[PDB]
């Protein structure tokens, strides 16, 4: 009845999803054939005699990431045709995935998600997973966002978009692939979380103490935030908060639904022995500015809302004391019109650590999702990357030649300029 | 799937392409008899990018060998890894395009277009749906720059939307062969700017400079000169054939490298290039490979990249390297060489990580970049052409062949304006 | 099925345990084929582990310690770099406190008995003699390959000399310490060992 | 009489090893062009499909049409599933029974408990998956 549906589009979303369905398998203890040796019901489907098939769809026109899922050891986990893969990659262009090479598989993906959605009735939410910097995640994920928007309009849609880094690119068209996504993703999704690759790089050099990581170490630690967010859907707890109440508790004004993320503790077997993890500091390390996931220094921002899902052996009577410490602290400034901005959640399940991983078995953890007025710096430089690149019109000729005409470059730029000036309108 | 169809034309291109399928087949593990060996599933699951199965279990390369002088095709057959190609794919000629660009393109150029387009059509339509067309040719000689470049224009009007690439050698700055090169290169640049998507330049005197210093070789024949160009050839299509942490295609490299439709000529570089003495005493690390990235004495191109700013450069890393050490080093090379990049584009570097290193090595990287210093060969060949034409030399075997003086004045107006746009953007 | 199926320890363990299960079924409802937790094996035979002073010690001594196999070569420069740091780590990490926390089993890829004994004289932890085949079975079982001299059944070589890897009770490999691997943290990843959790039993 | 693998010494398999699994006969000969690309894909399928279950569910019996004992041995050295001895007559009877000429090879036949043919799939040209392990459970 009340369950959630997950969409992975683009090879970042596949591999983030690949690690996401690692931790989900290990938490509920399902064996990678598909059968364990009703918490499982919130993500899976009983395909008869004990077989579980997950409620996820993988969508990429680049066939070289879905096939390596197909050939990988998780081949029988998925029902063999949610993994729909086109003929050729959208190639880092918003125009290519949204118009030309998009439509022949959107209809297959729409028809894919339909029978999953009406397996039950009263389904809760949608889980996007995409790289907004590339081609087939941004443009194609828009199409799956807008086509689902008109069909299933009473449903929440959660996005987990790996926002492009300030300094790191690994694709030079990302300034163009952002602004042409931000307009066409803002007014169409309900809830989206910023994640940045070099920010989680600075996480893993400082806390977990690895100098030279891999994307697989990035996504595994992103997957910890994902499972801890949906933990109240899965597992029973003292005070649980579901997906349906993020417009209720996190969205002040209808446009503004961009949120950061945070996680604590993130420590190895190195210093787990050398440090006890009390609730005083895990809520202090959570708000510590070098511990978010999106580079966003909140000293030149103002907080507006916060949602803490404590998990593990946490008693609620020190939760209230711990959050009272933060409000008394003066370096963090909430906005004047919002007197209370803390939402507390407690689950009874300790976080799980994957075998052969790099996180330690902590006893209790906190996953934090916040609204700050510090996202002004986030949208300012990707406005500042766009207006210089277009200042005398670089790279336009593949956008114009593919179908996006001139003017969507313009209209999205004041669409972003509207979004920047709305944030400054809030904080005064 | 997506398959690249190969065209080998000219005296030069047939020798380079002979070494191409030499080096692809043994890293993919296919014997010269065509059978597979190696027992590695990753070498097999994408083999149809370059091969077609032959209902005997053996493979056959999808390369069309085309020339107007019958000696070089018999040379390719007589060489090793030469039985792979299909004899129906060989389209010989007998007149010999005698280094006259007109006659490789019209006079006896026209009489093999029917046979060479017919055999590439048979290859093109039998498949799933193709992706691109890599060709190997030369811009100095006659049948490389006439006969294959007409194959460019007849194919591109036939398939207008698909990508195609050229790995073309250029006239050398210091000493030229085939003394009518300035006429050849200028008459072939204004077909390439109209009908080619990316032109990866190789220059012969710089290739010897690689064998001067970074290899310290003594007597390099046309075996190991072509063998090192084939290394760069395999690097640009490495990421299609194999999986990786960040997969990139030939078209996706074209999306983010060509900023404006005209300037699409590329300087190539390959690392590591080690002398055999220093091979023991060298650390092969991601911050070390990225320094031979921006080594002016390492580029396959002849120009000096230090006299200009790169507009956009890409790096196809191969191997099991850490992603952080990659993109930080790209930012490392960007910040301190700030004066050597162009400013009106942020974060110029492109990087792409595959998970398969080439045979016999642990880590490699292929550099494909767009410099404004490539204007030198477009300036040095230019004043070569304008010098000879001012006293009207050698033109009577063009004017006697069909090209009159309207297109020659047109051809220089194409290429010198290409010098103007490169200078316009710096 | 841990670490790799194409491995002589796993296949002999499942041969012996399938024989034991068939004998039990013939003597006496039991599941065929048995689950992975059902197979139990005495991993180290009797005449395998010897300390300094060359006294053979049974496997039962290793209880309550974090045990690591150390695959090493005498001629390898990276091994020569790694050994002093690992000596000091053993020294400090094991004299601190009341129990013998870590313990190291040395397996040699050396090129003869003379090299094996000479490189063995430098080390205070346990070792396995080269004559007993358990060295060869162990090195292929953990797929630690020096050069491509032994063919594989499609499994890729994880790492080579030098390598440190910490062990579990059922032969399950716990983790490779990243000395010469994708991480490549030389002489500094020795302190990534998780001696509280990794406990031989 | 029929052989499974072990490094160092060759161990014969139990007759009760095949309980509750599905047995596919796999025909190959070394040096053949198609066999060299049918071996690795069925290797990967063996590993993936049969080694998620705590109970193994499939078994593949290797039959070689080779002309040389040493060549059969060196390809057995790559084969991770079970096979049969060259000098035994069961291989000859099985190839003369299941209708395999000496370009039909390589091919697979899933059988039943009685040993008679339950399904045939060749490879003359994604077709390995057409066999399901849930089909031939044995008692």
């Amino acid at each position: 009845m009340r369950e959630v549906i997950s969409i992975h589009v683009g090879q970042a979303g596949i591999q983030i999803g690949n690690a996401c369905w690692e931790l989900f398998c290990l938490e509920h203890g399902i064996q990678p054939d598909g059968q364990m040796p009703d918490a499982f019901n919130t993500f899976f489907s009983e395909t008869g005699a004990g077989k579980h098939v997950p409620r996820c769809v993988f969508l990429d026109l680049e066939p070289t990431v879905v096939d390596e899922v197909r050939t990988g050891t998780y081949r029988h986990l998925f029902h063999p045709e949610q993994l729909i893969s086109g003929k050729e990659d959208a190639a880092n262009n918003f125009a290519r995935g949204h118009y030309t090479i998009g439509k022949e598989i959107v209809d297959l993906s729409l028809d894919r998600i339909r029978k999953l959605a009406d397996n039950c009735t009263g389904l809760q939410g949608f889980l996007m997973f995409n790289a907004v910097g590339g081609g087939t995640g941004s443009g194609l994920g828009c199409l799956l966002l807008e086509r689902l928007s008109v069909d299933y309009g009473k449903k929440s849609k959660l996005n987990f978009c790996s926002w492009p880094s300030p300094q790191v690119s690994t694709a030079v068209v990302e300034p163009y692939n952002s602004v042409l996504s931000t307009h066409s993703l803002l007014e169409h999704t309900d809830v989206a979380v910023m994640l940045d690759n070099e920010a989680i790089y600075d996480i893993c050099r400082r806390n977990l103490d690895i100098e030279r990581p891999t994307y697989t170490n990035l996504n595994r630690l992103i997957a910890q935030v994902i499972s801890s967010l949906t933990a109240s859907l899965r597992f029973d707890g003292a005070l649980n908060v579901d997906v349906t109440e993020f417009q209720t508790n996190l969205v002040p004004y209808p446009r503004i639904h961009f949120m950061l993320s945070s996680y604590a503790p993130i420590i190895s077997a190195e210093k787990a022995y050398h440090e006890q993890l009390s609730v005083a500091e895990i809520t202090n390390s959570a708000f510590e500015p070098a511990s978010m996931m999106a580079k966003c220094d909140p000293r030149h921002g103002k907080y507006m809302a916060c949602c803490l899902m404590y998990r593990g052996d946490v008693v609620p009577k020190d939760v209230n004391a711990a959050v009272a410490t933060i409000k008394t602290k003066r370096t963090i400034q909430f906005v004047d019109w919002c007197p209370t901005g803390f939402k507390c959640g407690i689950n009874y399940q300790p976080p799980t650590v994957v075998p052969g991983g790099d996180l330690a078995k902590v006893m209790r953890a906190v996953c934090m999702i916040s609204n700050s007025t510090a996202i002004a710096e986030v949208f300012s430089r990707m406005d500042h990357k766009f207006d210089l690149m277009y200042a005398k019109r670089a790279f336009v000729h593949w956008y114009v030649g593919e179908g996006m005409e001139e003017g969507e470059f313009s209209e999205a730029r004041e669409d972003l300029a509207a979004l920047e000036k709305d944030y400054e309108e809030v904080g005064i | 799937m997506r398959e690249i169809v190969h065209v080998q034309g000219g005296q030069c291109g047939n020798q380079i392409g002979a070494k191409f399928w030499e080096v692809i087949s043994d890293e993919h593990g296919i014997d010269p008899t065509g059978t597979y060996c190696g027992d590695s599933d990753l070498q097999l699951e994408r083999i149809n990018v370059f091969y077609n199965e032959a209902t005997g279990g053996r493979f056959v390369p999808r390369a069309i060998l085309m020339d107007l002088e019958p000696g070089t095709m018999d040379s390719v057959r007589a060489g090793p890894f030469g039985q792979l190609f299909r004899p129906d794919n060989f389209v010989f000629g007998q007149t010999g395009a005698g280094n006259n660009w007109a006659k490789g393109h019209y006079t006896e150029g026209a009489e093999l277009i029917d046979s060479v387009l017919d055999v590439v059509r048979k290859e093109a339509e039998g498949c799933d749906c193709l992706q691109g067309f890599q060709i190997t040719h030369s811009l100095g000689g006659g049948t490389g720059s006439g006969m294959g470049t007409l194959l460019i224009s007849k194919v591109r009007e036939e398939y207008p939307d698909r990508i195609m690439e050229t790995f073309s050698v250029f006239p050398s700055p210091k000493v030229s062969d085939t003394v009518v090169e300035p006429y050849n290169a200028t008459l072939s640049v204004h077909q390439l700017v109209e009908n080619a998507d990316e032109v990866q330049v190789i220059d012969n005197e710089a290739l010897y400079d690689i064998c001067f210093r970074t290899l310290k070789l003594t007597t390099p024949t046309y075996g190991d000169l072509n063998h090192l160009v084939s290394a760069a050839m395999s690097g640009v299509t490495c990421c299609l054939r194999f999986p990786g942490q960040l997969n990139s295609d030939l078209r996706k490299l074209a999306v983010n490298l060509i900023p404006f439709p005209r300037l699409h000529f590329f300087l190539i570089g390959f690392a590591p290039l080690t002398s055999r003495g220093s091979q023991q005493y060298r650390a092969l690390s991601v911050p070390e490979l990225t320094q031979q990235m921006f080594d002016a004495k390492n580029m396959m191109c002849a120009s000096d990249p230090r006299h200009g700013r790169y507009l956009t450069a890409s790096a196809m890393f191969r191997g099991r390297m850490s992603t952080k050490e990659v993109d930080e080093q790209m930012l490392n090379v960007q910040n301190k060489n700030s004066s050597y990049f162009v400013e009106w584009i942020p974060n110029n570097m492109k990087s792409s990580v595959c998970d398969i290193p080439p045979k016999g090595l642990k880590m490699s990287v292929t550099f494909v970049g767009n410099s404004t210093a490539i204007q030198e060969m477009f300036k040095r060949v230019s004043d070569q052409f304008t010098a000879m034409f001012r006293r009207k030399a050698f033109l009577h075997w063009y004017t006697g062949e069909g090209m009159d003086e309207m297109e020659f004045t047109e051809a220089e107006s194409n290429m010198n304006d290409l010098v103007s746009e490169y200078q316009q953007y710096q | 099925s841990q670490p790799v199926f194409a491995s002589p320890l796993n296949v002999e363990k499942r041969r012996l345990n399938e024989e034991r299960a068939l004998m039990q079924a013939q003597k006496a409802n039991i599941q065929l084929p048995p689950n992975y937790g059902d197979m139990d094996l005495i991993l180290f035979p009797e005449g395998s582990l010897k300390n300094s002073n060359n006294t053979v010690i049974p496997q039962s001594h290793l209880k309550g310690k974090s045990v690591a196999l150390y695959f090493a070569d005498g001629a390898d420069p990276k091994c020569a770099s790694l050994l002093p740091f690992l000596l000091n780590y053993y020294r400090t990490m094991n004299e601190g406190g009341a129990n013998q926390k870590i313990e190291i089993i040395f397996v040699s890829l050396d090129r003869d008995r003379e090299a094996f004994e000479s490189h063995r004289a430098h080390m205070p932890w346990l070792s396995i003699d080269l004559e007993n085949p358990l060295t060869e079975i162990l090195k292929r079982h953990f797929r630690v390959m020096k050069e491509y001299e032994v063919p594989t059944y499609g499994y890729g070589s994880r790492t080579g000399v030098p390598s440190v890897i910490v062990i579990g009770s059922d032969g399950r490999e716990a983790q490779f310490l990243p000395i010469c691997s994708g991480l490549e943290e030389g002489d500094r990843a020795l302190l990534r060992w998780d001696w509280r959790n990794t406990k031989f039993a | 009489v029929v052989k499974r693998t072990q490094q160092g010494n060759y161990v014969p398999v139990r007759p009760d090893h095949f309980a509750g699994v599905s047995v596919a006969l796999f025909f190959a000969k070394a040096g053949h062009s198609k066999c060299a690309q049918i071996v690795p894909v069925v290797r990967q399928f063996y590993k993936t499909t049969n080694f998620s279950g705590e109970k193994a569910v499939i078994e593949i019996i290797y039959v070689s049409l080779d002309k040389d004992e040493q060549d059969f041995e060196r390809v057995r050295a790559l084969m991770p599933w079970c096979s049969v001895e060259y000098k035994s007559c069961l291989r000859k009877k099985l190839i003369e029974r299941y209708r395999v000429p000496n370009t039909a090879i390589p091919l697979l036949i899933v059988i039943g408990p009685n040993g008679e043919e339950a399904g045939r799939m060749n490879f003359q040209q994604f077709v390995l998956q057409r066999w399901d392990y849930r089909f031939n459970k044995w008692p």
Binding site: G29, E68, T214, T216 | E27, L42, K359 | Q2 | F51
Partner: peptide
């Protein structure tokens, strides 16, 4: 010469043991 290179996904996402 042999080939000894594997992808990131295949060489990493091994079938991990289930927690107790």
């Amino acid at each position: 010469l042999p080939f000894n290179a594997q992808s990131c996904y295949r060489s990493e996402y091994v079938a991990k043991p289930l927690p107790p």
